[PDB]
Amino acid sequence: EEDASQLIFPKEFETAETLLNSEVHMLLEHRKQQNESAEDEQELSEVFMKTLNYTARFSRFKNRETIASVRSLLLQKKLHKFELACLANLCPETAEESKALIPSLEGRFEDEELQQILDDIQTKRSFQ
């Protein structure tokens, strides 16, 4: 009934606002720091640790200012939240790969503009 290839989401996931992997890492590390202080509170869930380490391994934007810059550059583009987050997380390098990993980008943007956006992504990717 649902299909992420054509943005087929349930009615519950209509107001769903996406998050970046670096955003999740930063917020969950802030939660972990809160857990470090404010004693008489036990450890968080195994889900918390797994998600935190998983998004720490796959983090691509090492700076919150980088997060803000990417969000500002992509939010002014005519994209859905899901497409925006998927592009900012997978980070493709060729427009063909951008349209292949996300088949809902077929015709949304011009492939030259899409390649410009991908080059902007590779420009704003905090390398390691």
Binding site: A16, E17, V24, V47, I102, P103
Partner: protein, 171 residues
């Protein structure tokens, strides 16, 4: 996709657990009950971002505990059909492939894996590799899988990945 949404949950506070500070008890209760949970309609409940609104406490007639409807910003995740997601390989098997997306276990069957990526127990880590041995998918790798679909279940949305389409496999 990692989501930032607002969710509504009701907390039952019994009079023995009121205390001098009542709202902090409710906040601890919410951080206890829903963190790390998983629902079929909202996915993996990762964490609660900010407890926004605390509703009026309705004393249940006959019952002693008060009921608090609570609205809270929350970070969650939900696997989707056809979404290409990065993953960490945990085990390579002759039947399938055990990978992880956050806390989610993803099983990619070899039947939906192209004929190039053959299985080899003969390498010391049993791995997926081609006869050219260019793409070597093994344990603790960074790969990408297009989710065929997910088994939505009680506190579990474990997914099934795909490698059939283009640009799928090792990063």
């Amino acid at each position: 996709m990692f989501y930032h949404i607002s969710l509504e949950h009701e907390i039952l506070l019994h009079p023995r657990y009121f205390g001098p500070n009542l709202l902090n008890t409710v906040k601890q209760k919410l951080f206890t009950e829903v963190e790390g949970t998983c629902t079929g309609k909202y996915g993996f409940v990762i964490a609660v971002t900010t407890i926004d609104n605390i509703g009026a406490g309705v004393i249940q007639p006959g019952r002693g505990f008060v009921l608090y409807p609570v609205k809270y910003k929350a970070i969650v995740f939900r696997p989707f059909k056809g979404e290409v997601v990065d993953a960490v390989v945990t085990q390579v098997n002759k039947v399938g492939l055990f990978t992880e997306i956050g806390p989610m276990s993803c099983f990619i069957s070899r039947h939906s894996i192209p004929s190039e990526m053959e299985f080899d127990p003969n390498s010391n880590p049993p791995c997926y590799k081609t006869m050219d041995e260019d793409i070597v998918i093994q344990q603790d790798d960074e790969i990408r899988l297009k989710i065929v679909g997910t088994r939505v279940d009680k506190n579990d949305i474990f997914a099934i990945g795909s490698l059939m389409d283009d640009y799928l496999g090792l990063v």
